[PDB]
Design a protein around this nucleic acid. Structure first.
Ligand SMILES: Nc1ncnc2c1ncn2[C@H]1C[C@H](O)[C@@H](COP(=O)(O)NP(=O)(O)OP(=O)(O)O)O1
Ligand SMILES: [Mg+2]
Ligand SMILES: [Mg+2]
Length: 430
DNA sequence: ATTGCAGTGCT
DNA sequence: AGCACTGC
């Protein structure tokens, strides 16, 4: 009762840009705005691989990983923007720089954890306390939450989307105890007000729209964000969790989308996150390990402690290229020419990173794939990264993998290489 | 013949 | 350290 932790100590948000690479290309080329369009990399094989899709195009069934030729079958008027190609490979610089634009805006409001190229977690606990003391027990107007959904509402004793949103918001705000500055529901609500302001700043200053989730931890904030994408934000309160989880497939919770989540379903014979509450912590630890079992016991009750890490920059800088089918690299000159292409992009990005961020990478990770291996990687070796020089990095990379050339004669490479990967890591201040 | 990125945890 | 797993 009084000693049962409820996991309501923090206010955490997750901001996730809407169809991000599409918005970057639509900002640049107004002809693509408000159209079914997609972003594709390469073009020769089946029209290119789609990596991002506008919401107008999703209505036709176009999805990521689809070949553009196939997407055109569902959406003949689909417009396409191509990822830049430099040195014979896709180059994501435009999207990395657009990401920096958004992350720098978010950092004005609170410390952020860069979770991917287009999403960040925000710890708003402190910002909420300061806004709460400034309000002075002032009620929160619905006009301050013009794009916010309250998950689970309306409920109890209009057939249009926006009417429902407002009805749920009104029920939430009517029930709110604005007199108590330690009320978790009030704290989430102020958090949502701040996230409205953050999202308005992102859109004003970049043109980009995004969705957000506001809750008490990262997993619930991420889950909340997806509930009303695009261009909306969703508040998931602690009280909303039992009903939300009662029909929520386990795989929807971050970190349970793969083999572990599949094993939870199979071993326990359950389907939904809420069903996990019927197991003891020791039972879950016995099946999934001490760490996973404790995490699951708390998470199915809406409780998680993983902190928002103060990290705005990526901690690795990597470049990779696949050589599928008949393009697999089969000669030494080939392997050496492509390692140089990769090393030259990496040098360009590393030099820019050092100037911008006052740090230097110290380790070079070299990874390859050989034809036949189903694994993403077939070998990974690390060597020292002492100079930002493409020719040196490419020469060193060749040195650590040259022993894998099984061909008796040097000039040939066997079995052929279907992937080259270079990654700079182990940053130190400079 | 998805591709090209990333971070965390195990051992 | 090298690898499996999981997420954009
Ligand atoms: N498997 C992949 N391979 C290459 N690029 C990818 C990728 N998955 C995503 N990207 C790139 C392209 C994506 O635009 C960007 C962000 O990833 P998301 O947030 O999963 N997808 P989006 O933001 O487009 O749509 P919304 O959030 O509205 O659902 O990362
Ligand atoms: Mg995302
Ligand atoms: Mg996104």
């Amino acid at each position: 009762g009084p000693h049962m932790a409820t996991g309501q100590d923090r206010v955490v948000a997750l901001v996730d840009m809407d169809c991000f690479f599409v918005q970057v290309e639509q900002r640049q080329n107004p002809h693509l705005r408000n159209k079914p369009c997609a972003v594709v990399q390469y073009k020769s094989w089946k029209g290119g691989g789609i990596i991002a899709v506008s919401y107008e195009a999703r209505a036709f069934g176009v999805t990521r990983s689809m070949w553009a030729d196939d997407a055109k079958k569902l959406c003949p008027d689909l417009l396409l923007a191509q990822v830049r190609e430099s040195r014979g490979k896709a180059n994501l610089t435009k999207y990395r720089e657009a990401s920096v634009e958004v992350m720098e805006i978010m950092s004005r409001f609170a410390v952020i954890e860069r979770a991917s190229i287009d999403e960040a977690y925000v710890d708003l606990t402190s910002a909420v306390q300061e806004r709460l003391q400034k309000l002075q027990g002032q009620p929160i107007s619905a006009d301050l939450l013009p794009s916010t959904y309250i998950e689970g509402l309306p409920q109890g004793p209009t057939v249009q989307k926006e009417g429902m949103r407002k009805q749920g918001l009104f029920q939430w705000l009517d029930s709110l105890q604005i007199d108590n500055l330690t009320s978790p529901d009030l704290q989430l609500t102020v958090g949502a007000v701040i996230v409205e302001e953050m999202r308005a700043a992102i859109e004003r200053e970049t043109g980009f729209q995004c969705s957000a989730g506001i809750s008490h931890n990262k997993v619930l904030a991420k889950l909340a964000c997806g509930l009303n994408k695009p261009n909306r934000q969703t508040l998931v309160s602690h009280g909303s969790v039992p009903q939300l989880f009662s029909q929520m497939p386990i795989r929807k919770i971050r970190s349970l989308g793969g083999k572990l989540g599949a094993s939870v379903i199979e071993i326990l014979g359950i389907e939904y996150m809420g069903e996990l509450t019927q197991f003891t912590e020791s039972q879950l630890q016995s099946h999934f390990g001490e760490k996973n079992g404790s995490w699951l016991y708390a998470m199915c009750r809406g409780i998680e402690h993983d902190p928002v890490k103060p990290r705005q920059l990526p901690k690795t800088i990597g470049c990779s290229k696949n050589f599928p089918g008949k393009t697999a690299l089969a000669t030494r000159e080939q392997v050496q020419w492509w390692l140089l292409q990769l090393a030259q992009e990496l040098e360009e990005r590393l030099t820019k990173d050092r100037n911008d961020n006052d740090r230097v990478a110290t380790q070079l990770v070299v990874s390859i794939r050989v034809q036949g291996d189903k694994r993403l990687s077939s070998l990974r070796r690390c060597c020292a990264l002492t100079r930002y020089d493409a020719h040196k990095m490419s020469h060193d990379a060749f040195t650590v993998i040259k022993n894998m050339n099984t061909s008796g004669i040097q000039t040939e490479w066997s079995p052929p290489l279907t992937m080259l990967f270079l990654c700079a890591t182990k940053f130190s201040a400079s």
